[PDB]
Structure formats: C-alpha cells, structure tokens
Design a binder for this molecule. Structure first.
Ligand SMILES: *C(=O)/C=C\c1ccc(O)cc1
Length: 125
C-alpha cells in the first residue's frame, strides 16, 4: 500500500510523485480531472467502489459520460466554481447511484499542484 490518509492537509504534494501504478496502491478512490472534467487518471479503489474499469474511463468526461449523478450543483457546481476560481478544497458526503447499487461515499475535491488539474478523492462511509 501507499501510506496516505484520506483528507490529509498536504495530500496534493504527496500524490504528485505517484504514477498510475502507484495511485492504485491508495486506500481510497482517486480521480484526476482536467479543467473541463475529462478523466486523466482513475485508480483501482475508485473502480472497486463504482464498478468501472479504470482503463476504459480515462479520456472520458466525468460529469457528462461516466458519472452523470454528479452533474448537479452539489457536486459539478462546486467543481466548476473551483476551476473558475483556481482554488478548490471541499469535503462532503454523497450517494453514487448511476447503474449501480446506491452507495454512500465521502468525497474530497482539491486542486492539484500542476496548474489545471483537480483531484476527486472518494471513500466509503
Ligand atoms: C453517479 O454518477 C454514480 C456513479 C459514479 C460512477 C463512477 C464514478 O467514478 C463516480 C460516480
């Protein structure tokens, strides 16, 4: 495993060193999106939670194609405001329910260290 704790204050510095292989070693779901919501990275733990095959979702739009239940002011809305502002750091509970058994999760979104990428971290609650 990669020892990083969900919600950690410096998580963005830590995850900057990890490759797709490394990211698959996290205790939680990790997704990296560009400013337009396209999926740059998607780790194994997210695949375990949502049932999606990580390889198949990279390159797709998260809010439009892959995860339309997140297309709402309460999820996508916070994302777009953070991208516009160039600053994002929010944590909230949410229910994933698209093509899958409803699953309650904790979501943490944070701007990355590179200029126009953004993390979505997810774990069960
Ligand atoms: C809402 O969109 C439900 C499902 C979902 C599937 C995959 C990922 O990564 C997040 C959310």
């Amino acid at each position: 495993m990669e020892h990083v704790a969900f919600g950690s204050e410096d998580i963005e510095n830590t995850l900057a060193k990890m490759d797709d292989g490394q990211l698959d070693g996290l205790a939680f779901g990790a997704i990296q999106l560009d400013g337009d919501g396209n999926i740059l990275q998607y780790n194994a733990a997210e695949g375990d939670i949502t049932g999606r095959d990580p390889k198949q979702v990279i390159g797709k739009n998260f809010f439009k194609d892959v995860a339309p239940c997140t297309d709402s002011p309460e999820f996508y809305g916070k994302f777009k405001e953070g991208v516009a502002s160039g600053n994002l750091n929010t944590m909230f509970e949410y229910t994933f329910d698209y093509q899958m058994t409803p699953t309650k999760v904790k979501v943490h979104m944070k701007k990355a260290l590179s200029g126009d990428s953004y993390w979505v971290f997810v774990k069960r609650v």
